[PDB]
């Protein structure tokens, strides 16, 4: 399923395969496109192409008149026309389908993404004033200004938003189960041993969260409740990494545990998006301009670079909340990942 | 700040808060005030107060052979004096301010407005046509007739003109144009914006993204704000007229994707002394503004009789033979509310 942007002015029509490009582990998904240009008004007018990977965290013309703009994370530029010595050597078979489908003038293009780029992730707006807009995106544009590839303007450019979505690795980490014992000032015993034992380490948008919670008990302050609450860390880094807590979903029955025994239940949740639609500040995976997106996958930080990764650093965790008489809201958190 | 009206018999006076009332939407702005009458002419004569919402479309001692008069879409009546076992159950804080300042005589009065009623808006006359008019107005009358509640005249009737002025997605039209002497898309034209409800004080950028106006040279792109001056007396009636429009020579190229923002400011004092552009309701000599857009509530039983103003940025291009193609949108100008 191939798609085009016929550039507004019928000069530089850009034909591409896919708008979601895969963020692989060993590699990235590179671009493989062509650009049909017409030879009549493009006479000694030199076509190029770019990929402008860009962060967005605000208004256009307002953040224009400040001191900074956006910190474009990356920009690739390659010379389509006229071809420095005809540089398509390994053509794609989509670049082999288009060149024979279209007219002889079609000019290929191909971008290989580096290893230091975060993905396309967008903060969720709210119901209200919901446009201090944030989000990374990958965008790809054809252009031709008189001045050389280091200068351009808008009257030729063909812009087509794509994405790069992170994807989880090959091995999950060891079975995590770790939390508090909670000693007090007025009731003495070990008083709520709890085990939120789990089963896996890296989930996706296909499977739920079973949490095997194991009370161990000899009570002298009655328990009354265990809610379990999946919590997002919407960890934004502009000046600072920024933890913004809010629960994507949480569930509970009212199972009671008695004094002096050990209880156990598998509580379980699914974080949906349609339930978290029309809500504020819930990091979602990047959107293709109005197309449906999903809950943000876990972003992760590489094992030692020089420069702090700037952006929103989404984490997740089942917080196992308990309600105890006369109403103390006891809880604790762990690690787990939705990459 | 407060204002009153006194009769030439200084019999009935009316003290109020604000001639501009906010036509809210869940609610409206109810009228609040007091009537101040005198003792001894008003012995055994009964004072009342009314709100007259009216539709006006012509001349005073002329347009009364319309089979009718100003067809008063709504008229409200409440019993000022003798107060009638008085239900000012909520008396107002400004009526509280008026009752102790003035004598404890002050007869409070209050008006609920229903939902099927329009705002105050008029057609601007010509510079040459003298004896003509049109428009809505909301006025108040405080009076007393030796009668039953039905009979009513002047000289005790004190009349104050007040107002009931109303205090999307990023909306974008991108259209093609197919011809008889061209093949290409030949004009996609995207008028992208960032606001759909403006006021007096925030200008009009129209980000017009041109998409191939070639094979037929373009002269250029006019952008022109048109008020829709709808009027529904016997028939609904729009009267097209541009309030403002501005204009540079930026010249889109064959095989080059242009985009320009054109910056419009519809001002009143530039459209002062003109013809056919609704202004906001005004008070007897004082300065007013360009009319706010009115809206038609979702699902009334009976259609609204009034002037129903809207606006729109028409983007009229002009292409080589000077053939001026265009396209419009919806775009609505309500007030900002205190």
């Amino acid at each position: 399923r191939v798609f085009k942007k016929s550039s507004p002015n019928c000069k530089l029509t850009v034909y591409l395969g896919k708008r979601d490009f895969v963020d692989h582990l060993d590699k990235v998904d590179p671009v493989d496109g062509v650009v049909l240009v017409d030879p009549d008004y493009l006479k000694d007018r030199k076509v190029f192409v770019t990929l402008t990977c860009a962060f967005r965290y605000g208004r256009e013309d307002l953040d224009v008149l400040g001191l900074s703009f956006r910190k474009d994370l990356f920009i690739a530029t390659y010379q389509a026309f006229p071809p420095m010595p005809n540089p398509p050597r390994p053509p794609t078979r989509l670049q082999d389908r288009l060149l024979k489908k279209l007219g002889q003038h079609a000019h290929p293009f191909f971008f290989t993404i580096p290893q230091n780029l975060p993905c396309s992730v967008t903060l969720q707006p709210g119901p209200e004033d919901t446009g201090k807009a944030c989000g990374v995106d990958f965008e790809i544009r054809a252009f031709c200004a008189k001045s050389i590839e280091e200068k351009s303007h808008k009257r030729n450019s063909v812009r087509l938003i794509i994405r790069k979505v992170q994807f989880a690795p090959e091995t999950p980490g060891p079975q995590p189960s770790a939390e508090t014992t909670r000693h007090f000032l007025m009731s003495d015993r070990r008083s709520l041993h709890l085990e939120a034992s789990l089963d896996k380490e890296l989930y996706y948008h296909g499977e739920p969260l079973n949490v095997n919670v194991h009370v161990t008990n000899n009570s002298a302050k009655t328990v009354k409740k265990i809610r379990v609450s999946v919590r997002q860390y919407a960890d934004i880094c502009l000046f600072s990494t920024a933890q913004y807590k809010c629960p994507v979903a949480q569930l509970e029955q009212d199972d009671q545990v008695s004094p002096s025994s050990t209880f156990c239940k598998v509580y379980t949740i699914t974080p949906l998006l349609s339930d978290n639609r029309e809500k504020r500040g819930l990091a979602l995976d990047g959107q293709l301009k109005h197309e449906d997106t999903n809950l943000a996958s876990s972003t992760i930080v590489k094992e030692g670079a020089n420069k702090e990764v700037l952006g929103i650093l989404v984490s997740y965790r089942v917080k196992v909340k308990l309600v105890v008489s006369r109403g103390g809201d006891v809880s604790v958190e762990l690690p787990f990942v939705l990459m | 700040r407060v204002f009153k009206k006194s009769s030439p018999n200084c019999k009935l006076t009316v003290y109020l808060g604000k001639r501009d009332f906010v036509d809210h939407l869940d609610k409206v702005d109810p009228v609040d005030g007091v009537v101040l009458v005198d003792p001894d002419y008003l012995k055994d004569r009964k004072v009342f107060v009314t709100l007259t919402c009216a539709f006006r479309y012509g001349r005073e001692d002329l347009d009364v052979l319309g089979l009718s008069f100003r067809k008063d879409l709504f008229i409200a009546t409440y019993q000022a004096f003798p107060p009638m076992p008085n239900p000012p159950r909520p008396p107002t804080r400004l009526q509280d301010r008026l009752l102790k300042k003035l004598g404890q005589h002050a007869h409070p009065f209050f008006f609920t407005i229903p939902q099927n009623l329009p705002c105050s808006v008029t057609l601007q006359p010509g510079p040459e046509d003298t004896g003509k008019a049109c428009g809505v107005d909301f006025e108040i009358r405080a009076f007393c007739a030796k009668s039953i509640e039905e009979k009513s005249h002047k000289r005790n009737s004190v009349r104050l003109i007040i107002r009931k002025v109303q205090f999307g997605p990023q909306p974008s039209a991108e259209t093609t144009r197919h011809f008889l002497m061209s093949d290409r898309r030949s004009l996609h034209l995207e008028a992208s914006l960032d606001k759909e409800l403006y006021y007096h004080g925030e200008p009009l950028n129209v980000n017009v993204h041109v998409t191939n106006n070639s094979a037929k040279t373009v002269k250029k792109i006019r952008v022109s704000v048109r008020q829709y001056a709808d009027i529904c007396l016997f028939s609904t009636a729009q009267y097209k007229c541009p309030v403002a429009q501005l204009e540079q020579d930026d010249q889109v190229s064959p095989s080059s994707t242009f985009c320009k923002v054109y910056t419009i400011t519809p001002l009143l004092s530039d459209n002062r002394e003109k013809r056919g552009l609704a202004l906001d309701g005004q008070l007897k000599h004082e300065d007013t503004n360009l009319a706010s857009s009115t809206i038609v509530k979702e699902g009334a039983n009976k259609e609204v009789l009034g002037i129903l103003v809207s606006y729109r940025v028409k983007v009229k291009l002009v292409v080589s033979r000077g053939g001026d193609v265009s396209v419009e949108l919806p775009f609505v100008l309500m007030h900002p509310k205190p």
Partner: peptide
């Protein structure tokens, strides 16, 4: 400050 939009193409 660097640059701006057109604002929409959704598919082919």
């Amino acid at each position: 400050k660097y640059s701006a939009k057109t604002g929409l193409t959704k598919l082919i």
